[PDB]
From Swiss-Prot, chain A:
It is found in: Cytoplasm, Cytoskeleton; Cytoplasm, Myofibril, Sarcomere, Z line; Cell membrane; Cell junction. It comes from Mus musculus. The modification Phosphoserine is found at residue 69. F-actin cross-linking protein which is thought to anchor actin to a variety of intracellular structures. Association with IGSF8 regulates the immune synapse formation and is required for efficient T-cell activation. Coiled coil: none annotated. The chain holds residues 822 to 892 of 892 of the full protein. Signal peptide: none annotated. It comes from the Eukaryota. Homodimer; antiparallel. Interacts with MYOZ2, TTID and LPP. Interacts with DDN. Interacts with PSD. Interacts with MICALL2. Interacts with DNM2 and CTTN. Interacts with PDLIM1. Interacts with PDLIM2. Interacts with PDLIM4 (via PDZ domain). Interacts with IGSF8. This is Alpha-actinin-1. Belongs to the alpha-actinin family.
UniProtKB/Swiss-Prot annotation, chain B:
Residues 1-23 are annotated as: Important for interaction with STAC1, STAC2 and STAC3. It is found in: Cell membrane; Cell membrane, Sarcolemma; Perikaryon; Postsynaptic density membrane. Coiled coil: none annotated. The lineage of its organism: Eukaryota, Metazoa, Chordata, Craniata, Vertebrata. Detected throughout the brain, including hippocampus, cerebellum and amygdala, throughout the heart and vascular system, including ductus arteriosus, in urinary bladder, and in retina and sclera in the eye. Expressed in brain, heart, jejunum, ovary, pancreatic beta-cells and vascular smooth muscle. Overall expression is reduced in atherosclerotic vascular smooth muscle. This is Voltage-dependent L-type calcium channel subunit alpha-1C. The chain holds residues 1664 to 1686 of 2221 of the full protein.
């Protein structure tokens, strides 16, 4: 709404192509190794109706990043 | 595009820092 997480999420969805999971190397190609590695580690094992190899659930990153320890 | 999406990510991270410094 007044944030930019909802926007990033929509952009991520479009980044992967209406997929709740994105390729580890693909996001590493978009985001710098530093952020990409953190994202890869902060992501969760895809989880869905189809096991996507080399791709993990990105929604978990936004969820982990959504929860603040002082908000 | 891919470049715009990444731009938004960086901007969010960027403004997030300032937001936290404020409250």
């Amino acid at each position: 709404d007044t944030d930019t997480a909802d926007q990033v999420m929509a952009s991520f969805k479009i980044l992967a192509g209406d997929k709740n999971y994105i390729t580890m190397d693909e996001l590493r190609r978009e985001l710098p190794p530093d952020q990409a590695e953190y994202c890869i580690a902060r992501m969760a094992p895809y989880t869905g109706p189809d096991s996507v190899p080399g791709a993990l659930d990105y929604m978990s990153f936004s969820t982990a990043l959504y929860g603040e320890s002082d908000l | 595009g891919k470049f715009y999406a990444t731009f938004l990510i960086q901007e969010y991270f960027r403004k997030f820092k300032k937001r936290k410094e404020q409250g």
